[PDB]
């Protein structure tokens, strides 16, 4: 909760410094499971209102089994469920792999018999995988019970208003546990309170085989974690209905991370096309993991609370600690920082965690004010810093941005616009990838190509 | 009404003009409340049937609220900064309370916050007047009068609403977009927009467009104290309005001379949406953040870029000296279409086999190697390769404007053809950089001969 | 159901074989109905609760006929427009009659294939009948002055009735008139499975639709159209599948560079073309998002508006990626960070740099150890791949898969003419690019012999 | 009368006149929810009534 | 006089008249009982 | 000023101390940049030059 | 600092350049108080 962020005038970018890390690293599947009737559709004449209103719930209950069986044959939930370098990952992986176990024989007869006499246990599967299982509905106890001597008769026993009514509503989890994966062939993400109570998740994050700082977290954050879950259907037979849930786990936590935002650094030394520009491209959330950074490019990949980013290394690369050198000298000699170049002459403003970058560039109305002050700087053509001190808005063209108020302390690093340094006559201005090394070489090139064509002229 | 478009043959681009904007520029913020009887806890010796449901719905409604307990504790931005900022100011204390007095004799109030914003403040449920009125009496005691049906079913009702905002904030963590019917039913979004600070004209469009004030609005959960729910809906605030817009399409223009793997591509890298703004051109380039309802273009402002109005001149010509008109360059001789506003845009290109049809006799036009475009009037649906477009069917009028593919004018020896993001003026740079090669590897042979 | 898989060495490449087509390659659109009653709001006096909720349901409805009325009145690929053909029968429907032809369709039957004025025959079915619960069970109630209160299974089983009309209007508002998927709401599964099989089409396609409703579902439309005549129309657009049964393959790329040179000497080469490729009609249909395509156990359920058109030699790349028939597509760098992809039953690791990769199982902990380079791994025996500090999973769907060594196609160039930064090349764009990096350098040392 | 166009603007007791000529960017603006008028060309008027 | 007209000090009356309203007086006088120099927020929305 | 040129052509507002103008954006008049051709050229063709 | 000035005989005018700005565009309000008795 100390957040502070710095910007370099040199690079364009700034980090701010000061984050938790909370990185998915791995997964979690337990089973769940809800018991059926094996009841037939009903077999009696029957015309009172009260009969026919039962007679529908079984039909919604019946037709919903029968749908359910579709999903469970016609793919069964078994599936595969980037940008530049990035691997590719099957974040179902994990879980489908158990629910093909359960298709096994008798591992739905074993977990049907461990859930006899408690409605949560652990089961080691005909893998050695242990796996959490709860029941969590119990529809075959009501409809044989309550229900079914009403239906079985030859002349239908009219039922109470109650005994309508309170079908209605044990009825109701099945049939919306139905429509979500109806809609979405099976896998769902994120898991609803359908597929999982909040009674639920919270008791299988207890008996869980984690630590307690993992569950601390895990049982806080609880939307987070509902975010970052999936839910697959898995099998339907023997009266039972089983679905398994797969659930972050959370391996890499309190790391410290920090963010890096970053905008075009474009020569104002010229009007319209002889400008020239660069840009960093490792913009993303970077973390301290294992003696690496884990770096993530997208930062959308992770969420963000109080101090604590919730990111996936699925979608992440693997860094030596080197890399934050690049965000104090980007010429060092260590590690070669990735850059990109144009000569698109834009402006463009960046919200950071308690500042604002903007970019001002060709005729652009750039401006940062206040509710109550107005405007408290125009900037000028070039790349510029404003924190949040007493700022409240920037505006760039027609387009207001409002600043993070995040409560924090930002520095201003001066340097000199690297982008001056540089010959705009041999500059190379395509590089949609590249790294300074790379463009200084491009450099060498021109730069020694007239070397020798000045000899021989 | 008159919604137009011109095809321009030496860009392989169309124009499609005649929409009205309406850009949200700025946000309202109110405050939704509901009001809970939390206080409540059910206890009793009574077993009927009918006792059992409300006992049942109890524990339902006491659930949804120690969960919501726990639930509350490319130009880049945050969205949702007015409405978190209505609701740090609601943590204050007293500031909820401010909120209930307001409400007390009346569901619509307008209360001034610490930070001077002045704010709708809504009740829409009073859980806490239903349940102490017509519930607490009965299951307070142990004698448990057992109640009628019609209030087992209609607790159960109104119990309802608050279940789905749970459900909906244990999935979202709080924001919500769009809002969604129960964060706000259509009834009382009616009702706040007849309530806002705005002109007449405004009031009537967001009436008008209820639907797409829905998808470009914030709810954001706020605070549960002093048993009162409290959550921020923000909503659109639209200060352009009825300025002129126009829809940029764009296709690849390539060489067909060549019949091989080598071929020059050029094609203009600037499409999407346009509208006037306070005397420039707000552009929006990911054309899936504009809405179009009828002949009307709600975009949100923050998804813009602010360009001079002489990109326009990129539509009349493409050579202008006063705009640099971006294009891009590969060496794909790769067959597409891009359906149009009222028309369609064929680029055909190698040995693929291009169709315009009609659903009453079949094929109607076939397409010679290049970039072409047909009106929606006689063609239903078009067909490049192992794709069929289905045509869109807006009634208006179309224009053909006929000139030389601007991609002949180019020599292929020297032309940079793996431009990514380049203009008109960044790829003649590169041209006469390449024909400096030329003469001084030339006349540097002229010395010896 | 075998699917097989091949990893080539030379590309660092890897083709899942084995599966079959089922592309949408057009629509199927239909008109859905739901019998409205249009009435005055409530004449009768009650505190009878029974009353009271009735009221409140029939408030309920006369919102959300009001709600409706307000929606009536609102790459290197191609552009469609996805519910351009669905739209147009929502404009078809919108002229006087044509509402009225379908009323009197229905008047006898709840499903009927109708003409309208345009000439074409659509499916139309009447999937709700509130009119007559209304005027039936509910009129003579509330009509008069002072109500004859009803039974309370007439309570329960309006709000029954009325909750589907109720829950087509939320999906209608909240997404602005289209909704996908079309939920059970808007089209039950007795209702999709009975269009299925009424529709004009292949018995094939009948098969294959009803078994995969789920997919139908994700790949249709909802399209509210009209409130007129006591009638709510809205047109669903089901996917047409024309492309079935033909072969489809999958393509996995990971990228390729020396490693023996240290640092920044290495040079870096990656296949582009990646993603699904079916053979269709004498082309390969190509679909190089990820996101278009949808596998149902071997069924690969893709779109042909996300699809390129190749020709089919686009398959020997995977053959031999040198070949002079067709020109394969790559792209160059000298960024080399260890990352995997995890292929349909295998995983391929691209290990650079002092990284750790590892391949694992479940019990006999690390089972492989990747050398620098790029390498595959087969999913029978694994069951997990770490790379660095990422864990990825390892899909066990079971099949056979072929290790196909060759030499790393990079090492076969010369690192010092290298094009390093090309981002849509081909082989022979590059073989273009070292011919006139060495021409130079060939010309200018012979020019100082 | 002249062929001034240039824009300029005028406070009145509860509002302000807004003259918006050529291209050069009128708005009217609230403190806590931003720009909530974009004038165009010609001769308009906001009271203050939310504006400020 | 092509020029226009405005309130050069209609920010700072903003301020003066929320001294006017009971409340903020007293609020500025317990800031500065006790130092010489302070920040106040004031009610309507400023901090001055 | 915000790549436009803001014009005082009052001669009381704009203040100079040392080599700085300190003037108040209220007493201008906001011009398109290319007034500042009517000093290179008044008969230029962009901007028409303000003569009496 | 260096200031330039030309002269244009074409339209009897001069133009001073080398100017720097300081354009006052917002307003900053404290409250100055008097403690009396």
């Given at each position: 909760?100390?957040?502070?962020?710095?910007?370099y005038?040199?690079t364009c970018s700034a980090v701010s410094?000061?984050?938790?890390?909370?990185?998915?690293?791995?997964?979690?599947?337990?089973?769940?499971?809800?018991?059926?009737?094996?009841?037939?559709?009903?077999?009696?004449?029957?015309?009172?209102?009260?009969?026919?209103?039962?007679?529908?719930?079984?039909?919604?209950?019946?037709?919903?089994?029968?749908?359910?069986?579709?999903?469970?044959?016609?793919?069964?939930?078994?599936?595969?469920?980037?940008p530049f370098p990035l691997?590719?990952?099957?974040?179902?992986?994990?879980?489908?792999?158990?629910?093909?176990?359960?298709?096994?024989?008798?591992?739905?007869?074993?977990?049907?018999?461990?859930?006899?006499?408690?409605?949560?246990?652990?089961?080691?599967?005909?893998?050695?995988?242990?796996?959490?299982?709860?029941?969590?509905?119990?529809?075959?106890?009501?409809?044989?019970?309550?229900?079914?001597?009403?239906?079985?008769?030859?002349?239908?026993?009219?039922?109470?208003?109650?005994?309508?009514?309170?079908?209605?509503?044990?009825?109701?989890?099945?049939?919306?546990?139905?429509?979500?994966?109806?809609?979405?062939?099976?896998?769902?993400?994120?898991?609803?309170?359908?597929?999982?109570?909040?009674?639920?998740?919270?008791?299988?994050?207890?008996?869980?085989?984690?630590?307690?700082?993992?569950?601390?977290?895990?049982?806080?954050?609880?939307?987070?974690?509902?975010?970052?879950?999936?839910?697959?259907?898995?099998?339907?037979?023997?009266?039972?209905?089983?679905?398994?849930?797969?659930?972050?786990?959370?391996?890499?936590?309190?790391?410290?991370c920090w963010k890096l935002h970053t905008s075009p650094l474009?020569?104002?030394?010229?009007?319209?096309?002889?400008?020239?520009?660069l840009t960093r491209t490792d913009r993303g959330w970077y973390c301290?993991?294992?003696?690496?950074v884990s770096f993530f490019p997208q930062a959308?990949?992770?969420?963000?609370?109080?101090?604590?980013?919730?990111?996936?290394?699925?979608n992440s690369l693997t860094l030596p600690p080197e890399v934050n050198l690049c965000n104090v000298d980007i010429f060092n000699?260590k590690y070669d920082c990735k850059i990109m170049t144009?000569?698109?002459?834009?402006?463009?403003?960046v919200?950071?965690?308690?500042?604002?970058?903007?970019?001002?560039?060709?005729?652009?109305?750039?401006?940062?004010?206040?509710?109550?002050?107005?405007?408290?700087?125009?900037?000028?053509?070039?790349?510029?810093?404003?924190?949040?001190?007493?700022?409240?808005?920037?505006?760039?063209?027609?387009?207001?941005?409002?600043?993070?108020?995040?409560?924090?302390?930002?520095?201003?690093?001066?340097?000199?616009?690297i982008?001056?340094?540089?010959?705009?006559?041999?500059?190379?201005?395509?590089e949609f990838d590249a790294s300074i090394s790379q463009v200084?070489?491009?450099?060498?090139?021109?730069?020694?190509?007239?070397?020798?064509?000045?000899?021989?002229?």
């Amino acid at each position: 909760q100390n957040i502070t962020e710095e910007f370099y005038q040199s690079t364009c970018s700034a980090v701010s410094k000061g984050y938790l890390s909370a990185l998915r690293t791995g997964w979690y599947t337990s089973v769940i499971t809800i018991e059926l009737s094996n009841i037939k559709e009903p077999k009696c004449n029957g015309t009172d209102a009260k009969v026919k209103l039962i007679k529908q719930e079984l039909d919604k209950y019946k037709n919903a089994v029968t749908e359910l069986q579709l999903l469970m044959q016609s793919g069964g939930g078994g599936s595969g469920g980037p940008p530049f370098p990035l691997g590719v990952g099957s974040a179902i992986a994990s879980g489908v792999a158990v629910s093909k176990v359960l298709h096994l024989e008798g591992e739905v007869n074993k977990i049907k018999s461990a859930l006899l006499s408690t409605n949560k246990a652990v089961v080691s599967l005909s893998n050695g995988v242990s796996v959490l299982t709860s029941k969590v509905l119990d529809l075959k106890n009501y409809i044989d019970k309550q229900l079914l001597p009403i239906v079985n008769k030859q002349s239908c026993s009219i039922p109470n208003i109650e005994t309508v009514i309170e079908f209605q509503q044990k009825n109701n989890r099945l049939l919306e546990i139905t429509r979500e994966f109806s809609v979405n062939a099976g896998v769902t993400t994120p898991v609803s309170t359908y597929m999982l109570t909040n009674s639920e998740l919270l008791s299988l994050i207890n008996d869980m085989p984690i630590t307690n700082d993992q569950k601390k977290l895990m049982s806080n954050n609880v939307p987070i974690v509902r975010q970052q879950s999936y839910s697959i259907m898995s099998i339907i037979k023997e009266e039972v209905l089983a679905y398994v849930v797969q659930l972050p786990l959370y391996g890499v936590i309190d790391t410290p991370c920090w963010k890096l935002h970053t905008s075009p650094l474009c020569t104002t030394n010229t009007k319209e096309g002889s400008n020239i520009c660069l840009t960093r491209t490792d913009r993303g959330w970077y973390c301290d993991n294992a003696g690496s950074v884990s770096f993530f490019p997208q930062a959308e990949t992770c969420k963000v609370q109080s101090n604590r980013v919730f990111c996936d290394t699925m979608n992440s690369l693997t860094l030596p600690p080197e890399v934050n050198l690049c965000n104090v000298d980007i010429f060092n000699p260590k590690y070669d920082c990735k850059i990109m170049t144009s000569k698109t002459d834009v402006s463009s403003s960046v919200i950071t965690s308690l500042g604002a970058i903007v970019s001002c560039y060709g005729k652009t109305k750039c401006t940062a004010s206040n509710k109550n002050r107005g405007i408290i700087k125009t900037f000028s053509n070039g790349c510029d810093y404003v924190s949040n001190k007493g700022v409240d808005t920037v505006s760039v063209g027609n387009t207001l941005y409002y600043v993070n108020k995040q409560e924090g302390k930002s520095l201003y690093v001066k340097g000199e616009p690297i982008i001056n340094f540089y010959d705009p006559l041999v500059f190379p201005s395509d590089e949609f990838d590249a790294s300074i090394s790379q463009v200084n070489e491009k450099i060498n090139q021109s730069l020694a190509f007239i070397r020798k064509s000045d000899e021989l002229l």
